[PDB]
Design an enzyme around this catalytic site. Sequence first.
Site, PDB file in Angstrom:
ATOM      1  N   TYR A  23     -24.079 -36.652   1.711  1.00 18.69           N
ATOM      2  CA  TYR A  23     -23.664 -35.924   2.904  1.00 18.69           C
ATOM      3  C   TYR A  23     -23.181 -34.518   2.579  1.00 18.69           C
ATOM      4  O   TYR A  23     -23.506 -33.564   3.280  1.00 18.69           O
ATOM      5  CB  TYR A  23     -22.554 -36.719   3.590  1.00 18.69           C
ATOM      6  CG  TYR A  23     -22.338 -36.394   5.045  1.00 18.69           C
ATOM      7  CD1 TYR A  23     -23.333 -35.802   5.812  1.00 18.69           C
ATOM      8  CD2 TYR A  23     -21.135 -36.696   5.660  1.00 18.69           C
ATOM      9  CE1 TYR A  23     -23.129 -35.531   7.162  1.00 18.69           C
ATOM     10  CE2 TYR A  23     -20.927 -36.426   6.999  1.00 18.69           C
ATOM     11  CZ  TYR A  23     -21.915 -35.842   7.737  1.00 18.69           C
ATOM     12  OH  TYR A  23     -21.684 -35.592   9.070  1.00 18.69           O
ATOM     13  N   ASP A  65     -29.436 -47.055  -2.277  1.00 16.29           N
ATOM     14  CA  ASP A  65     -28.096 -46.546  -2.524  1.00 16.29           C
ATOM     15  C   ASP A  65     -27.072 -47.258  -1.649  1.00 16.29           C
ATOM     16  O   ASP A  65     -25.940 -47.498  -2.084  1.00 16.29           O
ATOM     17  CB  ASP A  65     -28.064 -45.040  -2.278  1.00 16.29           C
ATOM     18  CG  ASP A  65     -28.675 -44.241  -3.421  1.00 16.29           C
ATOM     19  OD1 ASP A  65     -28.474 -44.619  -4.592  1.00 16.29           O
ATOM     20  OD2 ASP A  65     -29.350 -43.228  -3.139  1.00 16.29           O
TER      21      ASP A  65
HETATM   22  N1  LIG Z   1     -26.210 -36.500   8.110  1.00 17.06           N
HETATM   23  C1  LIG Z   1     -26.284 -36.982   6.869  1.00 17.06           C
HETATM   24  N2  LIG Z   1     -27.010 -36.300   5.956  1.00 17.06           N
HETATM   25  C2  LIG Z   1     -27.080 -36.771   4.710  1.00 17.06           C
HETATM   26  N3  LIG Z   1     -26.511 -37.862   4.197  1.00 17.06           N
HETATM   27  C3  LIG Z   1     -25.801 -38.517   5.120  1.00 17.06           C
HETATM   28  C4  LIG Z   1     -25.639 -38.160   6.448  1.00 17.06           C
HETATM   29  N4  LIG Z   1     -24.824 -39.068   7.107  1.00 17.06           N
HETATM   30  C5  LIG Z   1     -24.514 -39.938   6.174  1.00 17.06           C
HETATM   31  N5  LIG Z   1     -25.068 -39.666   4.952  1.00 17.06           N
HETATM   32  C6  LIG Z   1     -24.875 -40.404   3.708  1.00 17.06           C
HETATM   33  O1  LIG Z   1     -25.296 -41.748   3.873  1.00 17.06           O
HETATM   34  C7  LIG Z   1     -24.539 -42.500   2.906  1.00 17.06           C
HETATM   35  C8  LIG Z   1     -24.566 -43.978   3.218  1.00 17.06           C
HETATM   36  N6  LIG Z   1     -25.925 -44.527   3.265  1.00 17.06           N
HETATM   37  C9  LIG Z   1     -26.473 -44.940   1.972  1.00 17.06           C
HETATM   38  C10 LIG Z   1     -26.568 -43.867   0.967  1.00 17.06           C
HETATM   39  C11 LIG Z   1     -26.754 -42.957   0.207  1.00 17.06           C
HETATM   40  C12 LIG Z   1     -26.884 -41.880  -0.761  1.00 17.06           C
HETATM   41  N7  LIG Z   1     -25.971 -41.572  -1.664  1.00 17.06           N
HETATM   42  C13 LIG Z   1     -26.523 -40.488  -2.354  1.00 17.06           C
HETATM   43  C14 LIG Z   1     -26.034 -39.697  -3.409  1.00 17.06           C
HETATM   44  N8  LIG Z   1     -24.849 -39.881  -3.995  1.00 17.06           N
HETATM   45  N9  LIG Z   1     -26.821 -38.695  -3.865  1.00 17.06           N
HETATM   46  C15 LIG Z   1     -28.019 -38.516  -3.303  1.00 17.06           C
HETATM   47  N10 LIG Z   1     -28.583 -39.194  -2.301  1.00 17.06           N
HETATM   48  C16 LIG Z   1     -27.777 -40.168  -1.861  1.00 17.06           C
HETATM   49  N11 LIG Z   1     -28.021 -41.046  -0.823  1.00 17.06           N
HETATM   50  C17 LIG Z   1     -29.217 -41.037   0.000  1.00 17.06           C
HETATM   51  O2  LIG Z   1     -28.980 -40.357   1.222  1.00 17.06           O
HETATM   52  C18 LIG Z   1     -29.648 -41.045   2.303  1.00 17.06           C
HETATM   53  C19 LIG Z   1     -28.479 -41.585   3.102  1.00 17.06           C
HETATM   54  N12 LIG Z   1     -28.847 -42.184   4.374  1.00 17.06           N
HETATM   55  C20 LIG Z   1     -28.469 -41.686   5.548  1.00 17.06           C
HETATM   56  O3  LIG Z   1     -28.059 -40.535   5.693  1.00 17.06           O
HETATM   57  C21 LIG Z   1     -28.486 -42.666   6.691  1.00 17.06           C
HETATM   58  C22 LIG Z   1     -27.087 -43.182   6.992  1.00 17.06           C
HETATM   59  N13 LIG Z   1     -26.488 -43.807   5.822  1.00 17.06           N
HETATM   60  C23 LIG Z   1     -26.536 -45.118   5.604  1.00 17.06           C
HETATM   61  O4  LIG Z   1     -26.979 -45.911   6.424  1.00 17.06           O
HETATM   62  C24 LIG Z   1     -25.989 -45.589   4.268  1.00 17.06           C
HETATM   63  C25 LIG Z   1     -30.578 -42.040   1.621  1.00 17.06           C
HETATM   64  O5  LIG Z   1     -31.760 -41.309   1.315  1.00 17.06           O
HETATM   65  C26 LIG Z   1     -29.804 -42.398   0.358  1.00 17.06           C
HETATM   66  O6  LIG Z   1     -30.655 -42.849  -0.691  1.00 17.06           O
HETATM   67  C27 LIG Z   1     -23.132 -41.939   3.065  1.00 17.06           C
HETATM   68  O7  LIG Z   1     -22.285 -42.174   1.945  1.00 17.06           O
HETATM   69  C28 LIG Z   1     -23.402 -40.441   3.258  1.00 17.06           C
HETATM   70  O8  LIG Z   1     -23.250 -39.741   2.031  1.00 17.06           O
END
Ligand SMILES: Nc1ncnc2c1ncn2[C@@H]1O[C@H](CN2CC#Cc3nc4c(N)ncnc4n3[C@@H]3O[C@H](CNC(=O)CCNC(=O)C2)[C@@H](O)[C@H]3O)[C@@H](O)[C@H]1O
EC number: 2.7.1.23
Lengths: 261, 261, 261, 261
Positions: D160, D45
Amino acid sequence: MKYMITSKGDEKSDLLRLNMIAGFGEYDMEYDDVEPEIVISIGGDGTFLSAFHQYEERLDEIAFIGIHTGHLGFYADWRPAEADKLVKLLAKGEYQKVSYPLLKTTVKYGKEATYLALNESTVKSSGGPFVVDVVINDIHFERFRGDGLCMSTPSGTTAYNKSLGGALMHPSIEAMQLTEMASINNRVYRTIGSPLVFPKHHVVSLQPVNDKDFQISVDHLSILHRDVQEIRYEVSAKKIHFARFRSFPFWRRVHDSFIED
Amino acid sequence: MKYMITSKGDEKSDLLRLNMIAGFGEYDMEYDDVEPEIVISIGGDGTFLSAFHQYEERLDEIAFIGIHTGHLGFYADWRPAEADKLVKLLAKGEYQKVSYPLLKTTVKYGKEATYLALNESTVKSSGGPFVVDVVINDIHFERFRGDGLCMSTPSGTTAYNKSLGGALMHPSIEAMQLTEMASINNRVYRTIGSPLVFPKHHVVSLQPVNDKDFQISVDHLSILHRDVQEIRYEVSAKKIHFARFRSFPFWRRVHDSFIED
Amino acid sequence: MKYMITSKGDEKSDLLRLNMIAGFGEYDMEYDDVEPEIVISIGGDGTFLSAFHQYEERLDEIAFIGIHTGHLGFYADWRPAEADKLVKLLAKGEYQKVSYPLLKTTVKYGKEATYLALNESTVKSSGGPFVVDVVINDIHFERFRGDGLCMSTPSGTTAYNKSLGGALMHPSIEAMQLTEMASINNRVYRTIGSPLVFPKHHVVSLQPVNDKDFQISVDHLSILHRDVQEIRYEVSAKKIHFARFRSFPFWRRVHDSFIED
Amino acid sequence: MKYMITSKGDEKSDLLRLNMIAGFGEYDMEYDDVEPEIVISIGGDGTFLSAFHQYEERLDEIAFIGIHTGHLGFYADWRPAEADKLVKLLAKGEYQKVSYPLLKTTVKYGKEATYLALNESTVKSSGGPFVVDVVINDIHFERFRGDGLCMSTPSGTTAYNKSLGGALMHPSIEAMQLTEMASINNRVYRTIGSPLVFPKHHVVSLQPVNDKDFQISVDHLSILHRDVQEIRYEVSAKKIHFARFRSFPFWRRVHDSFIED
Ligand SMILES: Nc1ncnc2c1ncn2[C@@H]1O[C@H](CN2CC#Cc3nc4c(N)ncnc4n3[C@@H]3O[C@H](CNC(=O)CCNC(=O)C2)[C@@H](O)[C@H]3O)[C@@H](O)[C@H]1O
Ligand SMILES: Nc1ncnc2c1ncn2[C@@H]1O[C@H](CN2CC#Cc3nc4c(N)ncnc4n3[C@@H]3O[C@H](CNC(=O)CCNC(=O)C2)[C@@H](O)[C@H]3O)[C@@H](O)[C@H]1O
Ligand SMILES: Nc1ncnc2c1ncn2[C@@H]1O[C@H](CN2CC#Cc3nc4c(N)ncnc4n3[C@@H]3O[C@H](CNC(=O)CCNC(=O)C2)[C@@H](O)[C@H]3O)[C@@H](O)[C@H]1O
Ligand SMILES: Nc1ncnc2c1ncn2[C@@H]1O[C@H](CN2CC#Cc3nc4c(N)ncnc4n3[C@@H]3O[C@H](CNC(=O)CCNC(=O)C2)[C@@H](O)[C@H]3O)[C@@H](O)[C@H]1O
């Protein structure tokens, strides 16, 4: 010594129970379900809770052991494959006993009824809206409006308490934990929201505001009480004792049940 | 005896402090901010936390008292109007001392740093994603992915812990409580979710997975640590002592701060 | 034109209603509680919900107005002091009509019953454990185990939905929102946890797994249904129409009800 | 037609990309990463979000496709094994285009900067406490004190937003959703708590109270802004377009990512 075995009542648990009894027959073990010293529960957590309540008046003379043939089996320490190993180790004895705290509920009317809980005691209304005043060591803390309330033991914190947002607490802590079920919070009605954890000797009292009829559920046995004047919660002086033959820490039990296994 | 007074530093707190010092001048009380036996904090909870940390190496020789001129003032027991009453009652002495548990954080590198917390110790990453392995008494419990983690004392459970969904716990319970900040939970990543409450002598250890740099904040003093190998939490053997001149129960303190006053 | 007035039934609401009727007597307004075009509710939100259900088969010929003499009165637009101002402005007409979405519940057996909801439709079990399969547009989404489920309209999102952790959504959005009540989540049982928001034309279906008896509550009218094969939720094609004489935005209504006023 | 392919940059994704390019060489397809009509993202993603931002100024001339070689891959529609099937079906064309809403963030100083988000836009303070006034269509709704705030697109609600307790909302709904990160709630400070869902044309504005420096993170690109006077959120008029070759409903995508697969 004296023991008994309760079964979930399916083929698997019944046959396991018969095989353990046959194996106990080769030792100085008497089957006695009136004054057992060891109570074996073969089944799920529901079966274990039934066993606890079947003998709640001899808790200080009984050590419990759970064998899980059910689904989750949080209070279980043994898989059916180890039943022969358990029979042998139990035969000797010399085991360690571990004690978990229990919760006392008193219901007063206008007469007292007391109940003991291993998981939790909850309260809801009989039909109308649930409204009680919450009084902590005789000081009015809050008026609660919502679906109901849950008071959990430490080992109960992983059960209903957990689904209501409560904290999981190690059973070496002599405490009880109060969690809310869906409370109204707006400009006029406010609750604390957060779970509350009470030590021994603190008394939590629920006092009716209008309706006096409540459904009180102790370890999932739900009873309608009428004309209730007060519901009082406190950590029991009584404890449940477990026979432990090997280290199975609580936090590993938690990990195995909720994270992975 | 020996005392000192810290002030929030606004006009109100400074003048109150000067007036209490002038009143202490009519008793056998010496002002000594090197080896005080009584530490008075005039200000909010932040001012009280500063006072605690100013004297954290003489905790067993010091009893604290808070006067609130701030906004909330959760650790405060007195309003400014009662300052003259406090001076007089303190003058004699013969007060009751109450003790609350504290939290120890150890940070190891590749060298150890230890910190003491009255409210909580939290950990976040320096910039990248926060990923740690969570190990409880040397057993791997979970891998946490999210914003960070918060470990709270009992009296801290009403502060940041509360906003993270943790349970409020009476300070007579020697425990610490671990709460999550925004964790990822999907098919591949899972955490326990629920707050966790640990007794004395349990050790919680956070081990880095990739990034080794973390921002560790102890009572809102945030410090960047580099090349971290381990963060260990445990209930401290040290306690904060309060001078109490009248009953002000914790649950009433909670009610006044969150329900109504 | 044709109007009627419902009252909470206390002295205050009854006298207010009589005074509005007397004032309507000086205009070309006929009292008609069979085919009204304007329905006035004097009381709380419960009184307003009763009024909606009293006329749910003439929704496209009726504009509603709420006067709050109750406590919160979320659907109310007028205080009793402005009743004379309302009578006059209503007399002329030329008002703006605003429309909010509604929720349709269909219950199938083994025969169909349909219900319309302004706040929400919830489902719990009759006594045993609540277990349903959740099917979204014919695709099996999850198996839910817990206390029950709540499907809310947009204007209902500030009611029970809010206490269950749901999002507050502006009523201009044609949607429904599904929230969980206390679900089991462990190694074997998992739900999505999060609230779900569905657009128009999406169909959510609950299918029994074992027990077929459920308590279905539509705007707090709780009915026991037996031998249930399916419960289907969808945004209704029908809408409730409000008579608006002055701007009172939803988010201001929310602010006044939950933040301050 | 004109296409380009971005890669996560590991061996697997790089080789897959080279093989798809070689296969595209047998069709009337030109590789053009300046004015592509099709953008293929091979990776997770994060890789997909990078691709979206690489071409956010040609969104109405571009259809996106994700192939997941990463871990979760929520925006992905294809496994690497189907890459040859995708090349062939893309070659012809005649595909269906699906559009998801986007979020616009405007930052004003004392000069405007605008940003577009596919997942979310969040705001935290630069170091001190985060305090903003929250203004909805020019009406002061609340003062927020806490860690920060998150505004999510519909397709972002599973990211998030979900970890902060927000509702998952179908991307056919033109809305944005505001969720809180750890707010203070006591007798003096109160927030709404609940997530808020806004329709198109509603404007949410954050106004600083004291500190004017904020860390604003758009799809995980975090930028420090200084001397901020206002942050404004609104549903964008711009949309992201996906090339769809087979039904993969959102709620099935949700089920596969969070329940089981
Ligand atoms: N405390 C937190 N909890 C939850 N999510 C958080 C967070 N802090 C940031 N984020 C999200 O990270 C996105 C950016 N991330 C890539 C993207 C991802 C993405 N989008 C969607 C979507 N639309 N639906 C469903 N799963 C989705 N996921 C999945 O979520 C995980 C995200 N990874 C992380 O949390 C590590 C930090 N992030 C990055 O290095 C780059 C992965 O499994 C990914 O496949 C931000 O945009 C924010 O949302
Ligand atoms: N555990 C629970 N928590 C929260 N709400 C619950 C609940 N169990 C049921 N409900 C709601 O009760 C409604 C029915 N109720 C009248 C209606 C009200 C209404 N509607 C809205 C709205 N749209 N927005 C904002 N506030 C709204 N409120 C206000 O909410 C309170 C509701 N009162 C109760 O909880 C007592 C039991 N209820 C009744 O006797 C009749 C009052 O302040 C009211 O002004 C159900 O429909 C369900 O929603
Ligand atoms: N909405 C709700 N959400 C969550 N739990 C709820 C609930 N409503 C009731 N309960 C609990 O049910 C117990 C009674 N139940 C047997 C016991 C179990 C038990 N105890 C513990 C423990 N200490 N730690 C960890 N997992 C534990 N579990 C496991 O939890 C599940 C409980 N099953 C159900 O929810 C169905 C209804 N219940 C029964 O027929 C009999 C099973 O996997 C079980 O192995 C109540 O006591 C209450 O707690
Ligand atoms: N997102 C967050 N949500 C909630 N709390 C958060 C937070 N981020 C940090 N904190 C807490 O701030 C403490 C440090 N703070 C002074 C202390 C306070 C204190 N302690 C207790 C206690 N034991 N019980 C009950 N209320 C207590 N409060 C009250 O809480 C508020 C804290 N103010 C802030 O959040 C602004 C940032 N903080 C500071 O400049 C200095 C005030 O009303 C205060 O009277 C940290 O230690 C952490 O806990």
